[PDB]
């Protein structure tokens, strides 16, 4: 091809990280407002950045969510992995849920107040998001790179919901890396009670 040293062809491989769905979650991005995590060839989660909300209250009834066991275990594991990875999550009024019937919808409120005064809620939520959808998340948030600590978007809400499997990937190749990246370092940046 390019014949390095006159004797080596430069060749490539691209890995089909789809065959991995049987053992590990794969994430990808649709445009910038939709990010998906699949947990097999049947179901998964949708993560969207929106300027509307579904839940208009402040409750997340986790105790009831576990008293009953109507939810998919892998999907709950992923929600936990995402949630527990948010650094410095001191404001709990920012999180609301509807765990009724086994259905999962979780909202994180990214609204400011104060933006310049970064590092409150939206930053930690969006940083976690960038890892879960890593590689397909770079166009979802504004001001990519620049800083590491003042991550912001035009959207007011991050909403995570349960969905069905469809290919769902148009902006990035499916990859296990986002989930795996948040699998480790699960307990960091945790404030005392």
């Amino acid at each position, epitope marked *: 091809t390019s014949l390095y040293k006159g004797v080596y062809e430069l060749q490539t491989l691209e890995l089909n990280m789809e065959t991995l769905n049987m053992t590990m979650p794969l994430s990808c991005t649709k445009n*910038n*407002s939709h990010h998906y995590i699949m947990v097999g060839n049947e179901t998964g989660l949708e993560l*969207t*950045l*929106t*300027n*509307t*909300s*579904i*839940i*208009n*209250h402040k409750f997340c009834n986790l105790s009831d969510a576990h008293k009953k066991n109507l939810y998919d275990h892998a999907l709950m594991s992923i929600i936990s992995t995402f949630h527990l990875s948010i650094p410095n999550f001191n404001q709990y009024e920012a999180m609301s849920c*509807d765990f*009724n019937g086994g259905k999962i*919808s979780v909202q994180y409120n990214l609204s400011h107040s104060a933006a310049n005064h970064c590092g409150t809620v939206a930053n930690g939520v969006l940083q976690t998001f960038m890892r879960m959808a890593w590689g397909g998340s770079y166009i979802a948030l504004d001001s990519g790179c620049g800083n590491w600590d003042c991550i912001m978007t*035009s*959207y*007011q*809400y991050l909403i995570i919901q349960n969905t069905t499997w469809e290919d769902h990937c148009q902006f990035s190749r499916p990859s296990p890396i986002g989930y795996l990246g948040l699998l480790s370092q699960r307990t960091r940046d945790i404030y005392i009670s």
Partner: antibody, heavy 121, light 108 residues
Framework: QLQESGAGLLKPSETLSLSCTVD????????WTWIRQPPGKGLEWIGE???????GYNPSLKSRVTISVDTSKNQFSLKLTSVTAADTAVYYC??????????????????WGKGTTVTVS | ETTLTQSPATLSLSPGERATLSCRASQSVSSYLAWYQHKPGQAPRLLIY???KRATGIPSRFSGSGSGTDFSLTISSLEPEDFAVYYCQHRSDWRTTFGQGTRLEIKK
């Protein structure tokens, strides 16, 4: 293609109690909206509800109105207690949608019921 | 919160003339306004959404635009069938309002 339809009655006192039965297409993808139009007035919003029973209301009706949903029959019923002379209006039930993505975003009510007339005589 | 005001409460042109109905917001509008057409005895019909989208069954006679706090509904030729009442609609997260309503009238 789709048509929303409700029920009600003239109601001199007590509670308004209006009902709306949803057509069979996409109950969970829309915000269910109740609006009102008193004679001589423009349109007023009463409140809105989704399939998770998450609601919002017109603050002036906060103490009197509660909107409920029952997904097992795709039917949501308006509720307005202490109904009075000021509530003598035509009520409508409509399907709404809000495209909260990127920019510009938008909102509208597309499928409308025919209108229920309620008075308090 | 925010409100809408429609200044041209009564507007009168003969059929066939072009006309517009303005609508102003108290704050830069979160989202874009929708317009509804209403008839004396029926139900409101969505005419335009997102300032400029004409939806489906609405004829090309109806168009519009807007941004910021200033929006406008344009009727290209006022067909006699269109001389009724128009309303502005605005939705914020879990809250929405309507304008006062403006009316078209046929004169001779």
């Amino acid at each position: 293609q789709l048509q929303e339809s409700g029920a009600g009655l003239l109601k001199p006192s007590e509670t308004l109690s209006l009902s709306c039965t949803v057509d069979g297409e996409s109950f969970n993808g829309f915000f269910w909206t109740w609006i009102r139009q008193p004679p001589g007035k423009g349109l007023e919003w009463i409140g809105e509800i989704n399939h998770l029973a998450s609601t919002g209301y017109n603050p002036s009706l906060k103490s009197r109105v509660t909107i409920s949903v029952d997904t097992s029959k795709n039917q949501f019923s308006l509720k307005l207690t202490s109904v009075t002379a000021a509530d003598t209006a035509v009520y409508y039930c409509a399907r709404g949608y809000s495209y909260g993505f990127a920019w510009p975003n938008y909102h509208y009510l597309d499928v409308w019921g025919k209108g229920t007339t309620v008075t308090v005589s | 919160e925010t409100t809408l005001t429609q200044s041209p409460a009564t507007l009168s042109l003969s059929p066939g003339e072009r006309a517009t109905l303005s609508c102003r917001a108290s704050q830069s509008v979160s989202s874009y306004l929708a317009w509804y057409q209403h008839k004396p005895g029926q139900a409101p019909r969505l005419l335009i959404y997102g300032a400029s989208k004409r939806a489906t069954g609405i004829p090309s006679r109806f168009s519009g635009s807007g941004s910021g706090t200033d929006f406008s509904l344009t009727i290209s030729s006022l067909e006699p069938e269109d001389f009724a009442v128009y309303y502005c609609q605005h939705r914020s997260d879990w809250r929405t309002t309507f304008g006062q309503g403006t009316r078209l009238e046929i004169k001779k």
